[PDB]
Scaffold this active site. Structure first.
Site, PDB file in Angstrom:
ATOM      1  N   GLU A   1       8.907  10.630  -5.550  1.00  9.68           N
ATOM      2  CA  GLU A   1       9.097  11.940  -4.927  1.00  9.68           C
ATOM      3  C   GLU A   1      10.076  11.797  -3.768  1.00  9.68           C
ATOM      4  OE1 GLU A   1       5.043  12.867  -2.880  1.00  9.68           O
ATOM      5  OE2 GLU A   1       4.742  11.266  -4.349  1.00  9.68           O
TER       6      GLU A   1
ATOM      7  N   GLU B   1       0.998 -23.242   0.365  1.00  7.61           N
ATOM      8  CA  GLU B   1      -0.310 -23.664   0.852  1.00  7.61           C
ATOM      9  C   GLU B   1      -1.373 -22.632   0.508  1.00  7.61           C
ATOM     10  OE1 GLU B   1       0.100 -26.596   1.964  1.00  7.61           O
ATOM     11  OE2 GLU B   1       2.245 -26.542   2.423  1.00  7.61           O
TER      12      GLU B   1
ATOM     13  N   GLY C   1      -0.733   7.173  -7.778  1.00  8.42           N
ATOM     14  CA  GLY C   1      -0.064   7.274  -9.063  1.00  8.42           C
ATOM     15  C   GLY C   1       1.144   6.379  -9.259  1.00  8.42           C
ATOM     16  N   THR C   2       2.140   6.488  -8.376  1.00  4.31           N
ATOM     17  CA  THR C   2       3.332   5.656  -8.513  1.00  4.31           C
ATOM     18  C   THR C   2       3.068   4.236  -8.034  1.00  4.31           C
ATOM     19  OG1 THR C   2       4.321   6.066  -6.343  1.00  4.31           O
ATOM     20  CG2 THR C   2       4.603   7.760  -8.031  1.00  4.31           C
TER      21      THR C   2
HETATM   22  N1  LIG Z   1      -4.059   2.595   4.593  1.00  2.15           N
HETATM   23  C1  LIG Z   1      -3.334   3.645   4.220  1.00  2.15           C
HETATM   24  N2  LIG Z   1      -3.503   4.186   2.961  1.00  2.15           N
HETATM   25  C2  LIG Z   1      -2.768   5.257   2.574  1.00  2.15           C
HETATM   26  C3  LIG Z   1      -1.840   5.819   3.439  1.00  2.15           C
HETATM   27  N3  LIG Z   1      -1.256   6.860   2.806  1.00  2.15           N
HETATM   28  C4  LIG Z   1      -1.788   6.966   1.567  1.00  2.15           C
HETATM   29  N4  LIG Z   1      -2.733   5.986   1.413  1.00  2.15           N
HETATM   30  C5  LIG Z   1      -3.543   5.743   0.206  1.00  2.15           C
HETATM   31  O1  LIG Z   1      -2.811   6.167  -0.927  1.00  2.15           O
HETATM   32  C6  LIG Z   1      -3.580   6.999  -1.768  1.00  2.15           C
HETATM   33  C7  LIG Z   1      -2.708   8.125  -2.312  1.00  2.15           C
HETATM   34  O2  LIG Z   1      -1.768   7.639  -3.247  1.00  2.15           O
HETATM   35  P1  LIG Z   1      -0.250   7.305  -2.817  1.00  2.15           P
HETATM   36  O3  LIG Z   1      -0.237   6.302  -1.690  1.00  2.15           O
HETATM   37  O4  LIG Z   1       0.489   8.552  -2.397  1.00  2.15           O
HETATM   38  O5  LIG Z   1       0.401   6.602  -4.114  1.00  2.15           O
HETATM   39  P2  LIG Z   1       0.761   7.414  -5.461  1.00  2.15           P
HETATM   40  O6  LIG Z   1      -0.173   7.111  -6.609  1.00  2.15           O
HETATM   41  O7  LIG Z   1       2.181   7.071  -5.829  1.00  2.15           O
HETATM   42  O8  LIG Z   1       0.700   8.964  -5.045  1.00  2.15           O
HETATM   43  P3  LIG Z   1       2.072   9.779  -4.856  1.00  2.15           P
HETATM   44  O9  LIG Z   1       2.894   9.144  -3.762  1.00  2.15           O
HETATM   45  O10 LIG Z   1       1.735  11.196  -4.463  1.00  2.15           O
HETATM   46  O11 LIG Z   1       2.838   9.782  -6.155  1.00  2.15           O
HETATM   47  C8  LIG Z   1      -4.721   7.529  -0.917  1.00  2.15           C
HETATM   48  O12 LIG Z   1      -5.924   7.525  -1.650  1.00  2.15           O
HETATM   49  C9  LIG Z   1      -4.816   6.572   0.253  1.00  2.15           C
HETATM   50  O13 LIG Z   1      -5.939   5.735   0.102  1.00  2.15           O
HETATM   51  C10 LIG Z   1      -1.664   5.281   4.707  1.00  2.15           C
HETATM   52  O14 LIG Z   1      -0.843   5.773   5.477  1.00  2.15           O
HETATM   53  N5  LIG Z   1      -2.415   4.191   5.094  1.00  2.15           N
HETATM   54 MG   LIG Z   2       2.431  10.649  -2.437  1.00  2.00          MG
END
Ligand SMILES: Nc1nc2c(ncn2[C@@H]2O[C@H](COP(=O)(O)OP(=O)(O)OP(=O)(O)O)[C@@H](O)[C@H]2O)c(=O)[nH]1
Ligand SMILES: [Mg+2]
Ligand SMILES: Nc1nc2c(ncn2[C@@H]2O[C@H](COP(=O)(O)OP(=O)(O)O)[C@@H](O)[C@H]2O)c(=O)[nH]1
EC number: 3.6.5.-
Lengths: 297, 194, 113, 432, 436, 184
Positions: free
Chosen positions: E70, E253, E143-144
């Site tokens: 995105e 290590e 997702g990604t």
């Molecule tokens: N620790 C941490 N986890 C995050 C953060 N932002 C998102 N997440 C985790 O990421 C999950 C959401 O999915 P995304 O990180 O966006 O990955 P994705 O499957 O590609 O989702 P999209 O980016 O919308 O396509 C959430 O359930 C969070 O647990 C962050 O800033 N810090």
């Molecule tokens: Mg996202």
């Protein structure tokens, strides 16, 4: 130099238990259970000498004052106080390495592959139960059986002291050593571990049996002697341990000769048989391992 | 077994009385002893046994180490072995000078120990053969000898004062460094270097 | 007042200098000059000497001394007020001639005196 | 005449060798820039054993540095006395063993051992009469063990009749750095018994105990332990470089300490070692050196001699001393502790006197103990090794690089039979 | 000794633009991309060489690429404070999002972006000479971060193979998650990731929530406060590659001493001390308590109680003012403890590590300037409870074939769902049998 | 169990025709059902195992999870009818280095993956009833350098009709098989 190694097993055991009157060593029967059921395999190892002496507080403390080692002063107790007349008794008033045992018997639990493969029942072994010393009734012919799969099995069973197992193991080893031809050479690298394990335990009868089996192994072949020379590093230490152990009678005649109990001459004969068989560059390794050995021309 | 009911808690003895008034009626009557001091001794014994039941606790769980400047680099440094120290051991003063110490004292000190006496007489010598060489080889030996009453036979080894080439004593000596006879201030003469 | 290691954690003294090294028989030159950059940390009074890695010089160049507190041949450690420009500094039997100082170092010494 | 070539393997070997070179250079008076500035001519006649005068009063150590991580050689070059090493001797790989004996012995061995062999051969043929090689390494990591053992073996077939010293530290249970320590240690000690002439057993645990209790140091970093090891090596090699009343070289000690070729593991101790405040209040005579020398707690390894018998022993004395005190003290030691020395070897002690004490000291000593109590450490390593090997833990990190479980089997078997022969030689009466 | 990092997903990019800020603050590289000339911090060049590459004109560009589908999270990286720091080609954005669908980003959308990402990372690695090994960032619940976050790892494995790949993944919480389909993505990603990455460190958002609320005393911890601790952990576990130390360890290590079996690579991160400026200086921080503070379950980055499991192996990274004696002393006392325990076949399971540089405080951050810190990375059998619960809640949804029409409708089939399920069951059995 | 048994050329661990066939097997059913019905093509009673999730419903050979039976027979034979569903079964073996390996044959996978603990291979079936021979020793010798010693447990998953699962020591043919062991 015995025609049949197993031809004196039962006679010697019976003589030791009853005729001589000496107490027979009855140990390593823990976990064997009963018959007709498999032995619970203990994870203990026979060859390993797990002594690990622990002298936590009886270690004498070094004295920088006087170079002799001294024991620590006793802890004063409240039960024993200073009595009325002990003062005049006071006026009127040695460390060593603990054992470091090398000649003590090492335990050998009945956990060999021979035993397991026996209660499983895939071994074609039967006892003739004849009038003479018992032979082995072979269900399948000896010449066609696979030596690579069966030979390490039986040499691992030499370590048994249980009555129905050691005889069968020794007799099977005898039978394939007498029968086998040129097919012992490729499998001889696999036989070092069982021989070493049987030698590591400090049992007199086990050492005698394994020495006789080694003699017949090196004897009953064509050029196996030249293949045992690189493996002298793992067999000769026990020979070094027990080379000089021999009984001395000032003018008496040794009666216990028909049975080979004294391993002192057995080790000398085995070292000789090593010398003639595969004698090309063989004295160097034996002399390196055993320093007291002498050349047989 | 405490004589006094003080040791037990509240609801413990309450439940005991609910279950067994029998023990509940000894732990009060256990104080029937006529002598209060004896009962106090028994109370001390039971408290002491209860304390013995408990285990000791070490007070050094968190080790604290002082840091010079609170930096790992500084703490982990070990100083380099850089010394301009003289190589000869005899140059160092491991003992009182033999000159001031009394003559008979020096004599019997030699009598028990020749070696360190010879070293003190010969500060520049470093090997055993040099120190135990002769009382006549070194010209500086004669003042010590006639101060401590040690007779020196004539012509030992030779009349001409010489014959210590290895050790740098008297007028026969030169520093192994490049500006021999000392005093090197530039690179042209060596600056006391090789 | 605050602990020293937090008052000046990233404050670093940095000087430019060189030390001659007499090179031996060669058609190229009869003596060489090695540029060095000297680092002094105001946090824990720790020294550091490194070379600027000339491009085509065959000398193996890079870091010259571990970044650690150096001890002088006679005794007590170094002090910030012993790094004047145009003066000779003796470290590990070598003599570096300080040539130029960083602007931060210049103003720090100016405040110091 | 006699020459000692120094080789360092692994990072630990690099710091140990660096400390050794600094202390030896200070002993011989050469400054960190490689120029002599001493005052005694005795610092010149025997410096050829360690240094080669190149040109214009420049002395370079006869050392070859070997490692697998560039930070190690960056450190050893940057540190003091770091510019005295010739750059060509910095033979070096690129990738790193990563605490993997299999990698450092097979996967990086075939690519780097050629250059180290070439440089060590050139250095050996540069001098005239080789006395022997000296190798410092560790038995815990991969490049220290795997590369060093292969290098030692190759030098062994290349130069069979030449001497071979080995200062190797072994892992300890109370001080355990990595996880694969027994796996590397068993294989390293397997390779060491046949190739190396003898090995001197070291460990960080005993050094830590010594510096805690005897030195009474507050923060004993690795510098102090490496300084102790360096002083030990200097005391070992002093007889080669300085005159003495009674001489004893490397070959003399080797022949006087090794009764059988497989018994070449020694425990070492050093004395005097006193606290800073207590240094001025105590005297310098032979009895004080002897008392601290024979103390079981003064040994620089985790092998208590109280658990075994003394086969042979050595006492290398440095300083202006009396031979009569020397041999009477050693006779008293032998007679009082008559049960801790082997029976069939009378006079279990070799003694030597050197006339040059270390700088700042009046008397010094060095103890080489060939006691049969090292079997304790061997069994201690073996039990951990077989505990890990029974469940095949971490085995894929070695099997997948070329090895087989067979190698581990003969390794543990040879450790077992070496301990068995130690047990044999400990308690054996003069007559049977 | 150079390492490159790849960030996948909206969480990976947010973690990247908190780790790179810490890296820039660590070596004095200003956000413009060049170090200041009037004043310098620290000393010793080539320290940044493991993360940045110099162009010969006093420039430093990170060795990273931000990968996402995105084009809405890369823009504030393209228009933020660090506009000039990142090379434009490094930041890679797709056209349409996978929308929390592992299958979509794995097969339909991800196939058009993986090729150019591989092309870019190839010539990034070509500039490198001593590449230690890749390290990744993604969230398996997303997702990604799961679909192409696994496809790219597979293609890297088939392209290089022996190069190490470190996985710093954020697994979904047992009870606190922002989505409803995350068990499916978690299973389908762990199944493929089970045999590709060499190091897989677990993370949990609400565990970091708890530790920040307790130790740092923050009543409203957002994502910025979360990913600021992961940056510290990554810096601590790579600090030996940059600065010298008494006892240093590289990635090899870690692989050798933390992976007893090929499929058992799942580590439980921890850190100490997590302190605030108010309580930092009054407490007399020392090695003993900070090492003790690193083993209680209340400070673990994932809420997986190690009391149930057994430690096969543990790793420690000491930074700041630490000597090799007190670390051994603390390890001894910890081994003498009975609350924790180690597996039978491993008598010693410690891989200590001592560094010199103390952690660097970030301005406007939560942590304070601490003179010494410990970053612990363990490997315990307790982690079997995580998959045991995630698998159960995945089966709960899969019994009704809920949401499967979104995955299968993309073009996949139902077989690989079941093979991932049975692979997770096999992993459960493997973790069970090693604890005997 | 089975350590004191004769363990002849044939050994049956489960036969669908008996009073209590599942007497040693432990039932673990959830979102599924187990039945004993008669099928339409061999006119004999067979056991029913059907579940919505294949990994949820299964039956293990030893009831006690810690306790393991020991069978040395090389070949394992199963009689199952293909329902065109997902089905799998898992068998544990013991080698000569005393470690426990697992062999899982799955109907819904393509890849063949070799691992230190689990070996997964694809398996195909025809339309109607068919019998399968496993040949544990050959698989152990192929995937690993080890050899076969003991079989610790056998477990079958959902969506299958099982009857007369038994062990054997040889690749018995149709003619020489005993009457009770043929298909028809
Ligand atoms: N620790 C941490 N986890 C995050 C953060 N932002 C998102 N997440 C985790 O990421 C999950 C959401 O999915 P995304 O990180 O966006 O990955 P994705 O499957 O590609 O989702 P999209 O980016 O919308 O396509 C959430 O359930 C969070 O647990 C962050 O800033 N810090
Ligand atoms: Mg996202
Ligand atoms: N005496 C001493 N020991 C060290 C030093 N550095 C490391 N060690 C020891 O070496 C062991 C680890 O060796 P390692 O680094 O793996 O050697 P490598 O094979 O070269 O990688 C640890 O147990 C340390 O105790 C040092 O400077 N001095």
């Amino acid at each position: 130099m015995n025609g049949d190694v197993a031809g004196s097993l039962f006679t010697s055991t019976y003589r030791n238990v009853k005729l001589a009157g000496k107490a027979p060593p009855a140990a390593n029967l823990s976990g064997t259970g009963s018959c007709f059921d498999t032995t619970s395999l203990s994870p203990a190892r026979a060859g390993a000498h797990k002594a690990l002496d622990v002298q936590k507080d009886e270690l004498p403390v070094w004295s920088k004052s006087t170079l002799s080692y001294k024991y620590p002063a006793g802890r004063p107790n409240p039960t024993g106080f200073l009595k009325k007349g002990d003062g005049e008794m006071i006026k009127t008033k040695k460390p060593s390495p603990p054992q470091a045992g090398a000649y003590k018997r090492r335990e050998n639990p009945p956990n060999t592959a021979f035993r397991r493969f026996y209660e499983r029942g895939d071994l074609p072994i039967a006892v003739d139960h004849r009038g003479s010393k018992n032979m082995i009734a072979w269900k399948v012919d000896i010449e066609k059986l696979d030596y690579h799969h069966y030979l390490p099995i039986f040499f691992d069973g030499i370590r048994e002291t249980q009555e129905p197992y050691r005889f069968l193991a020794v007799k099977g080893v005898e039978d394939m050593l007498r029968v086998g031809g040129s097919k012992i050479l490729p499998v001889i690298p696999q036989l070092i571990i069982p021989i070493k394990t049987a030698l590591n335990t400090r049992d007199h009868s086990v050492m005698c049996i394994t020495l006789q089996l080694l003699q017949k192994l090196v004897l009953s072949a064509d050029l196996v002697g030249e293949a045992l020379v690189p493996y002298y590093r793992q067999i000769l230490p026990i020979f070094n341990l027990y080379k000089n152990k021999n009984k001395n009678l000032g003018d008496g005649i040794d009666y216990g000769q028909r049975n080979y109990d004294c391993l002192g001459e057995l080790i000398a004969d085995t070292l000789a048989l090593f010398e003639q068989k595969g004698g090309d560059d063989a004295f160097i390794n034996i002399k390196y391992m055993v320093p007291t050995y002498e050349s047989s021309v | 077994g405490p004589i006094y009911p003080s040791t037990l808690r509240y609801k413990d003895r309450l439940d005991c009385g609910k279950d067994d008034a029998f023990t509940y009626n000894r732990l009060y009557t256990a104080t029937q002893g006529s002598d209060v001091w004896a009962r106090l001794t028994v109370d001390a014994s039971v408290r002491q046994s209860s304390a013995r039941s408990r285990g000791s606790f070490q007070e050094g769980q968190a080790m604290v180490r002082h840091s010079f400047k609170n930096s790992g680099f500084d703490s982990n440094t070990c100083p380099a072995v850089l010394t301009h120290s003289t190589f000869k051991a005899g140059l160092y003063s491991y003992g009182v000078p033999i000159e001031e110490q009394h003559p008979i004292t020096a004599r019997r000190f030699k009598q028990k120990q020749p070696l360190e006496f010879m070293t003190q007489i010969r500060p520049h010598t470093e090997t055993t053969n040099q120190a135990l060489r002769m009382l006549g080889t070194y010209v500086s030996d004669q003042p010590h000898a006639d101060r401590l009453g040690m007779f020196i036979p004539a012509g030992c080894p030779g009349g001409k004062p010489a014959y210590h080439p290895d050790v740098t004593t008297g007028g026969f000596g030169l520093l192994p460094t490049l500006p021999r006879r000392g005093m090197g201030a530039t690179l042209t003469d060596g600056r006391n270097l090789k | 007042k605050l602990p020293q290691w937090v008052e000046n954690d990233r404050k670093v003294l940095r000087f430019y200098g060189y030390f001659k090294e007499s090179v031996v028989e060669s058609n190229m030159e009869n003596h060489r000059i090695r540029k060095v950059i000297l680092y002094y940390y105001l946090e824990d009074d720790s020294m550091h000497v490194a070379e600027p890695r000339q491009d085509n010089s065959g000398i193996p160049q890079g870091v010259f001394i571990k970044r650690h507190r150096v001890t002088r041949d006679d005794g007590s450690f170094f002090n910030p007020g012993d790094f004047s420009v145009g003066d000779t500094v003796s470290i590990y039997g070598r003599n570096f001639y300080l040539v130029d100082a960083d602007s931060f170092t210049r103003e720090f010494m100016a405040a110091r005196g | 005449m006699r020459e000692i070539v120094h080789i360092q393997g692994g990072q630990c070997g690099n710091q140990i060798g660096a400390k050794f070179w600094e202390v030896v250079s200070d002993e011989h008076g050469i400054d960190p820039t490689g120029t002599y500035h001493g005052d005694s001519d005795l610092q010149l006649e025997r410096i050829n054993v360690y240094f080669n005068e190149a040109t214009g009063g420049r002395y370079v150590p006869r050392a070859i540095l070997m490692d697998l991580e560039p930070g190690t050689m960056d450190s050893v070059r940057s540190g003091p006395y770091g510019q005295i090493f010739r750059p060509d001797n910095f033979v070096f790989g690129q990738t790193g063993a990563g605490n993997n004996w299999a990698k450092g012995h097979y996967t990086e061995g075939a690519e780097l051992i050629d250059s180290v062999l070439d440089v060590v051969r050139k250095e050996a043929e540069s001098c005239d009469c080789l006395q022997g090689f000296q190798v410092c390494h560790s038995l815990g990591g991969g490049t220290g063990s795997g590369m060093g053992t292969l290098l030692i073996s190759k030098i062994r077939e290349e130069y069979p009749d030449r001497m071979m010293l080995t200062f190797s530290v072994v892992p300890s249970p109370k001080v355990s750095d990595t996880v694969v320590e027994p796996y590397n240690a068993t294989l390293s000690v397997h390779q060491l018994v046949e190739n190396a002439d003898e090995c001197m057993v070291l460990d960080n645990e005993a050094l830590y105990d010594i510096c805690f209790r005897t030195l009474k140091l507050t923060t004993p970093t690795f510098g102090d332990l490496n300084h102790l090891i360096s002083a030990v090596m200097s005391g070992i090699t002093c007889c080669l470089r300085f005159p003495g009343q009674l001489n004893a070289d490397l070959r003399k000690l080797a022949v006087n300490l090794i009764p059988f070729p497989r018994l070449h593991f020694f425990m070492v101790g050093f004395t005097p070692l006193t606290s800073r405040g207590s240094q001025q209040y105590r005297a310098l005579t032979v009895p004080e050196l002897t008392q601290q020398m024979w103390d079981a707690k003064n040994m620089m390894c985790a092998a208590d001699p109280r658990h075994g018998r003394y086969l042979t022993a050595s006492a290398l004395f440095r300083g202006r001393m009396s031979t009569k005190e020397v041999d009477e003290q050693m006779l008293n030691v032998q007679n009082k502790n008559s049960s801790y020395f082997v029976e069939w070897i009378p006079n279990n002690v070799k003694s030597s006197v050197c006339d040059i004490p270390p700088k700042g000291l009046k008397m010094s000593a060095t103890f080489i103990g060939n006691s049969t109590a090292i079997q304790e450490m061997f069994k201690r390593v073996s039990e951990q090794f077989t505990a890990m090997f029974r469940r095949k833990a971490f085995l894929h990190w070695y099997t997948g690089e070329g090895m087989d479980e067979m190698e581990f089997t003969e390794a543990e078997s040879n450790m077992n039979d070496l301990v068995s022969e130690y047990q044999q030689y400990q308690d054996a009466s003069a007559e049977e | 000794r150079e390492v490159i990092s790849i960030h996948i997903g909206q969480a990976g990019i947010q973690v990247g633009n908190a780790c790179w800020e810490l890296y820039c603050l660590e070596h004095g590289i200003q956000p413009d991309g060049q170090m200041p000339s009037d004043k310098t911090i620290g000393g010793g060049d080539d320290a940044f060489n493991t993360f940045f590459s110099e162009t010969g004109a006093g420039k430093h560009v990170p060795r990273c690429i931000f990968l996402d589908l995105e084009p809405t999270v890369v823009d504030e990286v393209r228009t933020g404070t660090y506009r000039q720091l990142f090379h434009p080609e490094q930041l890679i954005s797709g056209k349409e999002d996978a929308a929390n669908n592992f299958a979509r980003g794995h097969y339909t959308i991800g196939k058009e972006i993986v090729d150019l990402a591989l092309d870019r990372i190839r010539k990034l690695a070509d500039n490198c000479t001593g590449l230690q090994g890749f390290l990744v960032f993604n969230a398996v619940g997303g997702g990604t971060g799961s679909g192409l976050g696994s496809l790219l790892l597979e293609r890297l494995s088939v392209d290089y193979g022996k190069k190490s790949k470190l996985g710093f993944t954020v697994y979904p919480s047992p009870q606190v998650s922002t989505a409803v389909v995350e068990p499916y993505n978690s299973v389908l990603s762990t199944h493929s990731l089970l045999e590709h990455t060499d190091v897989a460190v677990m993370l949990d958002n609400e565990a970091i929530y708890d530790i920040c609320r307790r130790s740092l005393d923050i009543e409203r911890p957002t994502y910025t406060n979360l990913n600021r601790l992961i940056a510290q952990v990554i810096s601590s576990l790579t600090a030996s590659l940059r600065f010298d130390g008494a006892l240093n360890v590289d990635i090899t290590e870690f692989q050798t001493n933390l992976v007893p079996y090929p499929r058992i690579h799942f580590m439980l991160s921890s850190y100490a001390p997590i302190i605030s400026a108010e309580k930092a200086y009054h407490e007399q921080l020392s090695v003993a308590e900070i090492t003790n503070a690193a083993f209680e379950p209340a400070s673990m980055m994932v809420k997986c109680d190690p009391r149930h499991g057994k430690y096969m192996a543990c790793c420690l990274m000491y930074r700041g003012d630490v000597v090799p004696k007190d670390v051994n002393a603390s390890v001894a006392t910890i081994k003498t403890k009975r609350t924790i325990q180690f597996v039978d076949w491993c008598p010693t399971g410690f891989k200590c590590g001592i560094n010199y540089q103390p952690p660097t405080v970030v301005p406007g951050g939560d942590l304070a300037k601490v003179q010494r810190a410990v970053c612990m990375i363990s490997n315990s059998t307790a982690i079997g409870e995580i998959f045991s619960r995630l698998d159960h809640k995945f089966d709960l949804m899969y019994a009704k074939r809920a949401f499967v029409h979104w995955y299968v409708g993309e073009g996949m089939e139902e077989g690989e769902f079941s093979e991932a399920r049975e692979d997770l069951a096999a992993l459960e059995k493997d973790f069970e049998e090693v604890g005997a | 169990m089975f350590k004191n048994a004769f363990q002849s050329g044939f050994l049956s661990v489960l036969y669908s025709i008996g009073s209590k066939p599942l007497e040693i097997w432990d039932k673990q059913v959830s979102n599924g059902h187990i039945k004993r019905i008669t099928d339409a093509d061999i006119q004999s009673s067979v056991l029913e195992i059907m579940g919505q999730n294949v990994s949820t419903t299964y039956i293990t050979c030893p009831a006690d999870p810690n306790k393991t039976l020991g069978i040395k027979l090389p070949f394992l034979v199963l009689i199952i009818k293909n329902l065109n569903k997902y089905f799998s079964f898992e068998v544990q073996v013991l080698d000569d280095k005393n470690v426990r390996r697992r062999f899982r044959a799955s109907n819904y996978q393509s890849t063949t993956r070799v691992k230190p603990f689990i070996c997964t291979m694809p398996m195909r079936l025809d339309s109607g009833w068919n019998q399968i021979q496993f040949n544990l020793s050959d698989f152990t010798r192929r995937a690993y350098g080890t050899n076969y010693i003991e079989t610790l447990r056998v477990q079958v998953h959902a969506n299958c009709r099982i009857r007369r699962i038994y062990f054997s020591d040889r690749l018995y043919s149709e003619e020489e098989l005993p009457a009770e062991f043929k298909l028809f």
